[model samples]
Target: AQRPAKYSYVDENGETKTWTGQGRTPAVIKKAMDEQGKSLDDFLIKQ
Candidate 1:
């Protein structure tokens, strides 16, 4: 089993959209970030 991934995506209005997913890794997040023109820092999960 693998750990689930969580992220906070930056919306068009600068708000955050949070999501949780299974079978998604940092590599997948990186690809999404690249496609969205977003930074890894922006995808940080809330504490």
Candidate 2:
């Protein structure tokens, strides 16, 4: 089976967001990068 979500963080609105560290980037992460000038490095799952 595929690995479950490998990364997660709370967003600007206090919502829980997650990513699998795989294919297409999630909308929440993209929005933060495009609109809020955030970096994907900031949310990396260091394991």
Candidate 3:
């Protein structure tokens, strides 16, 4: 079975990013947070 992703954020290329919340943040998510001046929760998938 595929690993359950803790966070799902769509990238600039229209791909649904599946993050396991296990390590360093993804590049697009991190970049958007800084560029948009928003917190991680903005893109976080509600549990």
Candidate 4:
């Protein structure tokens, strides 16, 4: 199967972050979720 090219959302620093919805979670995203109290749903890409 193919994969997504664009990221879910960009951070406050303007860094593009992508999540495959599989495997280990990305560090920056985890930090945003855990420390920054951001939700993954908040970053979901609009289809």
Candidate 5:
């Protein structure tokens, strides 16, 4: 199935959050992806 892209956020306390976005920039997206142990390819498949 097809789904919208998602993004994530992190506060100063290092707590992570997830959000929905049309897309993501590599750097910001990479930070969340690495932090969450997620991969773009995995998300795509999950979608």
Candidate 6:
């Protein structure tokens, strides 16, 4: 199935976040990009 996640990030307060590279770009990931100047590709799984 094409429904599994392609990226993950451990947010500030712990508990990881996941994204399937679809729909809205999840809040935590967005925050990281704005604050840290990092790219979504930076958190891709097994890069």
Candidate 4 vs candidate 5: the lDDT winner is 4
Per-residue alpha-carbon lDDT of candidate 4 for residues 1-47, written as tens digits (9 for 90 to 100): 47664346565456445554432356556677676656555565544
Q: What are the Cα lDDT values of the candidates?
A: 0.54, 0.56, 0.57, 0.55, 0.47, 0.58
Q: Which ten residues in a row have the lowest lDDT in candidate 6?
A: 15-24
The parts of candidate 2 lying over 4 Å away from their true place are 1-6, 12-16, 21-26, 45-47
lDDT, candidate 5, at 34: 64
Model 3, 1-47: lDDT tens digits are 57555655666555555555433375666776768845366556544
What's the TM for model 4?
Answer: 0.34
* lDDT order of candidates, top first: 6, 3, 2, 4, 1, 5
Across 1-47, the per-residue lDDT of candidate 2 in tens digits comes to: 66555556555555445554433465566776676756455555433
TM-scores vs. true structure, each candidate: 0.34, 0.33, 0.38, 0.34, 0.25, 0.39
**Model 2 clash pairs?**
none
Which numbered prediction scores highest in TM-score against the true structure?
A: 6
Which lDDT value does model 3 have at 39? 34
Pick by lDDT: 2 or 5, better one: 2
Task: Give the Å error, residue 16, model 3.
Answer: 0.5
In model 4, where do residues sit more than 4 Å from their true spots?
1-7, 12-15, 21-26, 45-47
Residue pairs with colliding backbones in model 4 are: none
CA deviation > 4 Å runs, candidate 1: 1-5, 20-37, 45-47
- By TM-score, is 5 or 6 better? 6
Error of 4 at 8 (Å): 1.9
Candidate 2 lowest-lDDT run of ten: 15-24
Q: State the number of backbone clashes in model 6.
A: 0
Q: For residues 1-47, could you state the per-residue lDDT of candidate 5 as single tens digits?
A: 37544544553344433444323455446665567755555433344
> What's model 1's TM-score?
0.34
Q: lDDT of candidate 2 vs native? A: 0.56
